[PDB]
Scaffold this active site. Structure first.
Site, mmCIF file in Angstrom:
data_model
loop_
_atom_site.group_PDB
_atom_site.id
_atom_site.type_symbol
_atom_site.label_atom_id
_atom_site.label_comp_id
_atom_site.label_asym_id
_atom_site.label_seq_id
_atom_site.Cartn_x
_atom_site.Cartn_y
_atom_site.Cartn_z
ATOM 1 N N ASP A 102 -58.510 -41.241 9.363
ATOM 2 C CA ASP A 102 -57.198 -41.120 10.421
ATOM 3 C C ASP A 102 -57.627 -40.546 12.461
ATOM 4 O OD1 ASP A 102 -55.640 -42.470 8.254
ATOM 5 O OD2 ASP A 102 -55.314 -40.174 8.318
ATOM 6 N N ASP A 108 -47.416 -48.469 15.032
ATOM 7 C CA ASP A 108 -46.710 -48.089 16.120
ATOM 8 C C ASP A 108 -46.499 -48.426 17.308
ATOM 9 O OD1 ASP A 108 -46.460 -44.648 16.628
ATOM 10 O OD2 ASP A 108 -48.113 -44.544 17.051
#
Ligand SMILES: [Li+]
Ligand SMILES: [Li+]
Length: 428
Positions: A363, A141
């Protein structure tokens, strides 16, 4: 240095993750599901270094490496351990906030080097670990944001810190001969479109060329880290197939993206990089921890053929895709299934399918107002709101499961769904 560290080695088994899995198995009523959960505990998952404290907290980086040494001695075979290097300054820059502790404006890059990379490198450099194969996944990311998200101030401000941080990390890790380095390069649902694909090839080529060993500085790339994108979409093998006068990639779910799956995407990137001067010894990893899409969720079961509904592009695609998410950008706490178990060289160009995200770990927390007592930097993200809409396209629900604990913590309800929905099913 091996061409592929996953060939002829067994994967590290993280005892701390496995303990959580076994505990879940013992709390599982269904005896079949419980036996499957038990089996899952025997597979290899990566160890995430997602903050400075992770280097020493609990058994710590040294503790995991010492455990890998013990598993190697016991097996009489080399062990390959995967580490995720994940603490860049202005981390996850496109999110309104990140759980990452370092910020560019607060000495982020300098601390990334001195307090995160340097102590990691010092530990990995210990001659005691020379017999291991150590795989380092570099900064999920990060770089793909510099392709698509530079309109966002936190990303535009993070450009040099990402580039210089990643170069620093790789330059230092390359001094250790048993460390194998793979750069994260998102997934097909992010960089698949022509402009994004070419922009990423340009960007990563520039980043790597500026490293001390140029194109020899890394060993490959990894896709799908902590995501859910299938490695193959067998009932949509042709993105240009005409249905109702339009190619299937024009479906709302894909938005003209020519890549529906990670195999095609990863191999296409590999060829493009070789074309730019990377040696053909580079290989790709795909995180298959949670992309199996067996079982049923989101109003569908796994398809067993192309849809018989050819009346519209959307109806056909939605009935044919194994990825059941409401929207491709739904990344948080999805009701998916465990994917292919870790395995070396499944196809040419692919070094391995690996489990980087450990199945069963959250998550993100599912509502605001709840602080993590063990990490003051962890924050609620609306993509994890079971009652909310996607931030990438508010026409779609997030699909996030409710009652989720903070990111990285054991998530009983999702772990059971992931095992029940495993594809191929878990063999107890
Ligand atoms: Li290789
Ligand atoms: Li395909």
């Amino acid at each position: 240095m091996l061409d592929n560290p996953f060939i002829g080695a067994i994967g590290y088994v993280n005892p701390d993750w496995a303990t959580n899995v076994i505990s879940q198995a013992n709390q599982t009523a269904d005896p079949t599901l419980a036996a499957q959960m038990r089996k899952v505990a025997t597979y290899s998952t990566a160890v995430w270094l997602d903050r400075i404290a992770a280097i020493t907290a609990g058994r710590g980086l040294r503790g995991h490496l010492d455990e890998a040494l013990r598993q190697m001695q016991q097996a009489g075979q080399p062990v390959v351990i995967t580490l995720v290097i994940y603490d860049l300054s202005n981390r996850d820059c496109s999110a309104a906030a990140s759980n990452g502790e370092l910020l560019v404006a607060q000495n982020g890059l300098a601390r990334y080097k001195a307090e995160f990379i340097d102590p990691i490198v010092a530990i990995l450099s210990d001659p005691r670990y020379a017999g291991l194969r150590i795989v380092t996944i570099i900064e999920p990311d990060s770089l793909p944001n510099l392709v698509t998200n530079l309109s966002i101030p936190a990303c535009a401000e993070a450009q040099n810190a990402y580039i210089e941080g990643i170069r620093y990390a790789v330059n230092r890790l390359r001094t250790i001969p048993n460390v194998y380095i793979y750069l994260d390069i998102a997934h097909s649902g992010w960089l698949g479109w022509d402009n994004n694909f070419n922009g990423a090839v340009n960007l990563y080529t520039q980043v790597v060329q500026g490293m001390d060993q140029g194109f020899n500085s890394i060993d490959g790339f990894i896709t799908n880290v902590a995501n859910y994108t299938p490695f193959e979409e067998p009932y949509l093998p042709d993105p240009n197939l005409t249905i109702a006068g339009q190619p299937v990639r024009s479906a709302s779910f894909y938005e003209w993206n020519p890549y529906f799956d990670e195999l095609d995407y990863a191999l296409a990137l590999r060829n493009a990089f070789i074309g730019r001067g990377f040696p053909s010894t580079i290989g790709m990893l795909i995180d298959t921890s949670r992309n199996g899409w067996g079982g049923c969720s989101y109003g569908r079961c796994r398809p067993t053929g192309p849809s018989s509904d050819t009346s519209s592009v959307n109806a056909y695609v939605d009935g044919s895709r194994v990825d059941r998410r409401y929207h491709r950008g739904n990344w948080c706490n999805q009701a998916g299934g465990i994917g292919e178990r870790p395995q070396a060289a499944p196809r040419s160009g692919i070094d391995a399918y690996v489990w980087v995200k450990p199945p069963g770990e959250s998550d993100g927390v599912s509502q605001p107002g709840i602080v993590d007592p063990d990490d003051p930097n962890k924050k609620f993200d609306p993509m994890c709101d079971p009652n909310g809409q996607s931030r990438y396209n508010s026409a779609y629900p997030t699909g996030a499961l409710p009652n989720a604990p903070h990111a990285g913590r054991w998530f009983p309800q999702q772990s059971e769904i992931l095992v029940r929905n495993a594809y191929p099913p878990i063999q107890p």
